[PDB]
């Protein structure tokens, strides 16, 4: 079937101890290995395997921090989820070109590019979109991403 | 000077004195060179348990994260001095935890509970019946003297020695103990190879193979009190009392060994050599033996010579200038550290301060 | 006399029969010589110790270590160390009734496995050159071996101990000439040695 | 003292005594040098199935995990007593759970006397009478620990050496540890393995010399420990005086026995080479006088005797330890300075020990 | 082609003389030194070669004893057999970051690791799913063990 976003709560209460395992670690392989994260991820989840990659590429985003990434409802009047690229956009912190960087990488680089810049960013989004989009993490996301981005960008300017 | 140093060479035969999860002897690399090793822990749990240290010392503290066998033991050891809901109250505000008779209990970690403590505290909790403070209230008086509840410690001594790490209940602001006992790990003073002993258990109606790993070596214990610390833990007790508790520690080092696989591997051996120094700063003699002493005529002869010499370096390098004695049973005789032919002699020089 | 530490490539040492044959290739006709495996199989090949009438001569598959030409002088009631691997047994006819060539019963050599047996073979064996003065008789697995080409099998015992000189000659003998069965396949060479 | 401390030096050729995985002699490197040695459990089983011990001690506690050996053996012996089910329902609950005959298996091996077996079948009337649920037994002999101890005067073995249960009911009423803590056995000085042969053929040819160090037999240094008081508790609380009885068996047993077909080197001129008994508040073993030594002279026995009582001179004075202690020497060496009674021979020893030193 | 389970029975049916010495043996290439190997091994075979090294580790795996591994056919109900994670993590013996440094290890240092850890635990398992795990012994089977354990003892 699919994750729900009990994930993001389930991140959200773990104990420092573990969480201090997941969040020490340099790449989403490095994380298969520690116990921590098959404990965690058992409900979601491991082994059906369709979605072991979504999880490792989920739980290494989340891995960032414990409110690195906040989790905000889309408002009734938007009727959509703040996303991403606007997320990363609207805080400002983010310089555009280690984002093009983001859409150049390739396997497990893109991955440890993105961690490093929700730290940095410390970004509001709807968790779900980044969710769906790193299930799939296809072109079209990673180019949906930087369009989101500059467009945002722009419209703030 | 504050700081007591006491150093031991002790020699054992064939034993596994000390082992892992897997049974497989302890050990540590040192100078490049293996050495079997016994844990501070296990000598430190050695001393509290054994024979000399209740004769001396007294009371060993109960270590467990079982409250309701706790519950039961008070209520049975104060039950007669107390009321039964007293001692529910006092242990709920010292760990932090409920009491429903529900035979589970549930400790976060495994804490030193000394008796006497408690019963201090019950004496406490009663003038609850005067007012009742909020338990909040009671922590501010309590915060205030620290000291009250170290003199109850003189019962229990080993956690003044070792110390205690509180987590939970009213222990975090009050039962936080450190020092003032520092003790290394246990080492051989050269390289030991791990004999295999392959043994079988013999079926009279009738083949099964097991193995165990022992060692035979020489082994160097260093440890360190720092007696301001210990007459701060003990409720400011005499530097004069606090130099006996030392002794005791100095006598229990040259003579106590764990006792893991005894019945088997009887390795009941006393010290070859101890040396005691009184000092401003700590010292070990570990360095005397990084370069791993060669067997002469055996291990421990050349063993005491490199510790001799060792610390004749650092002591010309070092300039230190302290109280000094050392026993042996081997005479080379230092250049200048005073000679005790017996442990008792040590052990008095000791306790007159090293003078 | 010469005594020397060979090795064996381990391509032409894997059956216990190939090893003389590649000892063989040492020289230089009926054998002169008796050796002791070491160490069965490393990297490099099989470790043996070579007691011979020849210099060994270096080959592709055998290789020499080094060599001593040694001439033995012995003294007389002067006590020694000694090894020797030796296949102590006993020649019998036969629990099963199975008979080969000329068609009458078949005989069988069979292991003395009880240490009582195996020392008295061994102070028997040696007799009036040397006194066993004292022996450990160590088990040592069977070994086994191909052809060619037939099936066999040698249980060894390694007798590791001191023992007294009452005869030289006898004794030197004994050595050049080794003791007991399957000299062959690495046994019976007497190694003697000082206290 | 509630300690008594046996030392013995008793020789013998290092031979056959006790074997490795590959049937070499059991060795340890004490001192940096390479000793033989014999395992505790070797000394100990020799002594168990002693001929001595089953005339002065009593009958040898038989270990096995074969249970269906064992309810034969247990049904033939106790079958006086009325029923076999009642037996094989003790077994059942002491070890769970046994069916006819069949091969089940116990968990591991561990000691069974006869004795308590039949005081179990004794106890299980309680069945019928309350009638009591096996659990309620359970916590109604828990109450009583003592009282099946005393079925360990056959079966000391036991009480000796100790037995742990894994399972069943033994768990609860069967935890038996001490009383004897026994060295595994160590020679006084080098003998020598792995000799380069190679190099051992250069010193050989004289040729014209004709010229060493003298042969040698064996010599083991034996060390044993026993608590009195763990023993009284491990027999059921009994005579001091007995448990003492049972010590000089031991120490007989000590000073005497060889394993695998051998004897003393000096059997038949004497009892015992070395033996001393010391009586102590502590455990205390003299290892370490052999640590150094010992280089021969002559032969091994004279200087490790010697060797030994220096060492016990300088411990007996540096750690002031005034005790009860006895030697039997027939070698004349320099003998002890301290307070030690000399015994002409070892049943005088063995007298001395009975009566607590005296 | 591949290797049967025939050679877990034919481990279990050696004589004693020849598993003494395979036991006898502190890594696996050293495994390859001794005869009684060859000889075990001729038959599945020695060598493809490409089957070499998985018949090492099986070989230096079953070394630990007779009843050290105990062969238990798969329950028509579980679909699989129980595994060498479940196992070990079952018997409650083994302590995970044994298992971890495990996950940790390198070539021989791997197996020597490993075969103390199963004569501590004597398991039960299901004989080819160990022979299918070290016939590749990737990082992925590895990952799989620590999965196994740390899922079943929570369970």
Redesign the interface.
């Known amino acids: 079937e699919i994750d729900a976003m009990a994930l993001y709560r389930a991140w959200q209460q773990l104990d420092n101890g573990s969480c201090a395992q997941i969040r020490r670690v340099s790449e989403p ?1 490095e994380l ?4 921590a994260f ?2 965690l991820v ?1 409900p979601f989840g ?2 059906n395997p369709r979605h072991q990659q979504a999880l490792l590429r989920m739980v290494f985003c989340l891995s960032a921090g414990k409110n690195v990434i906040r989790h905000q409802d889309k408002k009734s009047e938007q009727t959509t989820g703040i996303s991403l690229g606007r997320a990363l956009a609207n805080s400002g912190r983010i310089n555009e070109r280690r984002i093009f960087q983001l859409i150049r990488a390739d396997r497990t680089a893109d991955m440890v590019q993105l961690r490093r810049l929700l730290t940095h960013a410390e970004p509001v989004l709807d968790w779900p979109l980044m969710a769906r989009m790193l299930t799939w993490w296809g072109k079209r996301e990673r180019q949906q991403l930087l369009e989101d981005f500059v467009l945002t960008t722009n419209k703030n300017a | 000077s504050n700081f007591i140093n006491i150093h031991v060479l002790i020699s054992h035969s064939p034993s596994c004195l000390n082992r892992d999860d897997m049974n497989m002897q302890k050990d540590a690399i040192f100078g490049g060179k293996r050495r079997v090793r016994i844990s501070s822990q296990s000598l430190k749990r050695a001393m509290r348990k054994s024979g000399y240290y209740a004769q001396n010392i007294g009371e060993s503290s109960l270590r467990t994260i079982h409250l309701a066998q706790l519950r039961d033991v008070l209520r049975q050891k104060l039950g007669e001095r107390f009321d039964q809901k007293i001692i529910d109250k006092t242990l709920a505000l010292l760990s932090g935890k409920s009491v429903d008779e529900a035979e589970k209990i549930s400790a976060d970690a495994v804490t030193p509970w000394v008796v006497g403590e408690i019963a201090w505290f019950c004496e406490q909790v009663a003038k609850a019946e005067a007012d009742n403070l909020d338990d909040k209230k009671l922590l501010k008086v309590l915060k205030e003297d620290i000291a009250a509840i170290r003199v109850n410690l003189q019962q229990g001594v080993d956690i003044a020695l070792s110390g205690r790490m509180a987590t939970s209940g009213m222990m975090t602001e009050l039962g936080k103990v450190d020092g003032a006992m520092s003790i290394a790990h246990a080492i051989t003073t050269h390289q030991v190879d791990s004999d295999i002993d392959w043994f079988t258990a013999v079926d009279d109606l009738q083949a099964h193979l097991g193995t165990q790993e022992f060692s035979s070596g020489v082994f160097y214990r260093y440890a360190n009190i720092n007696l301001a610390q210990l007459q701060e833990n003990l409720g400011g007790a005499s530097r004069e009392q606090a130099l006996e508790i030392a002794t005791h520690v100095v006598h229990m080092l040259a003579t106590e060994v764990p006792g893991a696989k005894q019945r088997t591997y009887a390795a009941f051996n006393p010290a070859d050599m101890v040396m005691v120094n009184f000092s401003d700063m700590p010292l070990s003699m570990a360095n005397a033996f990084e370069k791993a002493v060669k067997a002469k005529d055996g291990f421990l002869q050349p063993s005491i010579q490199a510790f001799n010499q060792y610390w004749d370096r650092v002591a010309n390098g070092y300039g230190l200038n302290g109280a000094a004695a050392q026993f042996s049973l081997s005479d080379p005789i230092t250049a200048q550290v005073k000679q005790m032919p017996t442990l008792e002699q040590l052990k008095s020089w000791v306790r007159n301060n090293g003078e | 006399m010469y005594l020397s530490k060979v090795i064996i490539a381990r391509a032409w040492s894997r059956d216990l029969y190939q090893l003389h044959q590649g000892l063989w290739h040492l020289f230089p006709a009926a054998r002169d010589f008796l050796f002791h495996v070491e160490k069965r199989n490393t990297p490099e090949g099989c470790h043996v110790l070579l007691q011979s009438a020849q210099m060994p001569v270096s080959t592709a598959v055998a290789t020499v270590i080094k060599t001593k030409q040694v001439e033995f002088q012995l003294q007389v009631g002067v006590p020694l160390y000694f090894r020797l691997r030796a296949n102590p047994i006993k020649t019998i006819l036969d629990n099963q009734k199975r008979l080969d060539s000329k068609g009458n019963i078949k005989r069988c050599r069979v292991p003395l496995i009880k240490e009582a047996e195996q020392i008295a073979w061994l102070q028997r064996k040696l007799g009036n050159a040397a006194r066993v003065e004292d022996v450990h008789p160590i088990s040592e697995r069977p070994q086994y071996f191909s052809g060619d080409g037939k099936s066999g099998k040698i249980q060894t015992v390694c007798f590791e101990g001191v023992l007294t000189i009452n005869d030289a000659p006898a004794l030197i003998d004994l050595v050049q000439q080794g003791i007991g069965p399957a000299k062959s396949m690495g046994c019976g060479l007497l190694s003697l040695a000082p206290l």
């Open positions: 392989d298969r290995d520690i116990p098959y404990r058992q491991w082994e």
